[PDB]
Write an enzyme that holds these catalytic residues in place. Structure first.
Site, PDB file in Angstrom:
ATOM      1  N   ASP A  25       0.886  -1.365  -0.043  1.00  0.00           N
ATOM      2  CA  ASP A  25       0.046  -0.118  -0.143  1.00  0.00           C
ATOM      3  C   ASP A  25       0.684   1.342  -0.137  1.00  0.00           C
ATOM      4  OD1 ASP A  25      -2.265   1.483   0.073  1.00  0.00           O
ATOM      5  OD2 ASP A  25      -3.033   0.744   2.075  1.00  0.00           O
ATOM      6  N   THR A  26       1.094   1.948  -1.159  1.00  0.00           N
ATOM      7  CA  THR A  26       1.825   3.264  -1.361  1.00  0.00           C
ATOM      8  C   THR A  26       1.056   4.511  -0.848  1.00  0.00           C
ATOM      9  OG1 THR A  26       1.016   3.486  -3.598  1.00  0.00           O
ATOM     10  CG2 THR A  26       3.144   2.437  -3.079  1.00  0.00           C
ATOM     11  N   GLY A  27      -0.356   3.978  -0.653  1.00  0.00           N
ATOM     12  CA  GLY A  27      -0.958   5.031  -0.084  1.00  0.00           C
ATOM     13  C   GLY A  27      -1.004   5.545   1.423  1.00  0.00           C
TER      14      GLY A  27
HETATM   15  C1  U01 Z   1      -7.012  -0.701   3.002  1.00  0.00           C
HETATM   16  C2  U01 Z   1      -7.238   0.666   3.453  1.00  0.00           C
HETATM   17  C3  U01 Z   1      -6.144   0.901   4.727  1.00  0.00           C
HETATM   18  C4  U01 Z   1      -6.919   1.814   2.197  1.00  0.00           C
HETATM   19  C5  U01 Z   1      -7.936   1.749   1.145  1.00  0.00           C
HETATM   20  C6  U01 Z   1      -8.294   2.946   0.373  1.00  0.00           C
HETATM   21  C7  U01 Z   1      -9.258   2.927  -0.396  1.00  0.00           C
HETATM   22  C8  U01 Z   1     -10.192   1.936  -0.703  1.00  0.00           C
HETATM   23 BR1  U01 Z   1     -11.599   2.266  -2.071  1.00  0.00          BR
HETATM   24  C9  U01 Z   1     -10.077   0.716  -0.185  1.00  0.00           C
HETATM   25  C10 U01 Z   1      -9.083   0.652   1.125  1.00  0.00           C
HETATM   26  C11 U01 Z   1      -6.554   3.077   2.564  1.00  0.00           C
HETATM   27  C12 U01 Z   1      -5.521   3.830   2.324  1.00  0.00           C
HETATM   28  O1  U01 Z   1      -4.614   3.345   1.397  1.00  0.00           O
HETATM   29  C13 U01 Z   1      -5.542   5.106   2.729  1.00  0.00           C
HETATM   30  C14 U01 Z   1      -4.435   6.055   2.462  1.00  0.00           C
HETATM   31  C15 U01 Z   1      -4.393   7.098   2.867  1.00  0.00           C
HETATM   32  C16 U01 Z   1      -5.300   7.787   3.782  1.00  0.00           C
HETATM   33  C17 U01 Z   1      -6.522   7.204   4.019  1.00  0.00           C
HETATM   34  C18 U01 Z   1      -6.401   5.691   3.441  1.00  0.00           C
HETATM   35  O2  U01 Z   1      -7.724   5.141   3.796  1.00  0.00           O
HETATM   36  C19 U01 Z   1      -7.835   3.668   3.392  1.00  0.00           C
HETATM   37  O3  U01 Z   1      -8.915   2.995   3.825  1.00  0.00           O
END
Ligand code: U01
EC number: 3.4.23.16
Lengths: 99, 99
Positions: A25-27
């Protein structure tokens, strides 16, 4: 290796003497895993996601082998739907985005 | 280009005649953006994240220029903290993970 985005970027981590899979997860700034037994002390902590906020335990200096690479960082354990390896660990195993 | 994970992987998208920045998320199956004005019809939809579940509007066949690349997909608009470009769009602009 190189990984396309056609399927969820899943990977086998080894953590606290156990095997599990986890989502690249790069997010995510931090690493969060579902409820599992880890030795040592922790701190009550809170994070936010899409849905809202969850409350986690923080373990520091936890060794994780991601696809056979070593890394040691802060791992948050809680009520996540998914096993997240975010950017704190991503950098260690030398990960990049190419497009 | 190539992007290291030392800082949040942020990128300038153009959407519905407006400019915005957004987080490159290999963890995310779908693309979700904060509340903004888009033409056409939508469908009431629900997604889950860390925190819980949120309720979104679904727009289909929305053209997005991510760092100057074209792409056309389903964009969910709602109450997100962050602008997420996930895997539905990621594949189009030809993105990969390398480590
Ligand atoms: C699995 C989650 C942790 C992940 C996610 C994101 C969108 C969807 Br559609 C499904 C899952 C997630 C992040 O990767 C994230 C990143 C930055 C800020 C807020 C965040 O919230 C999140 O839920």
């Amino acid at each position: 290796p190189q990984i396309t985005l056609w399927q969820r970027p899943l990977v086998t981590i080894k953590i606290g003497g156990q095997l599990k899979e986890a989502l690249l997860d790069t997010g995510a700034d931090d690493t969060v895993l579902e409820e599992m037994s880890l030795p040592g002390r922790w701190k009550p902590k809170m994070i936010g996601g899409i849905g809202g906020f969850i409350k986690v335990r923080q373990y520091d200096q936890i060794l994780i082998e991601i696809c056979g690479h070593k890394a040691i960082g802060t791992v948050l354990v809680g009520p996540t739907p998914v096993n997240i390896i975010g950017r704190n660990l991503l950098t260690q195993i030398g990960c990049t985005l190419n497009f």
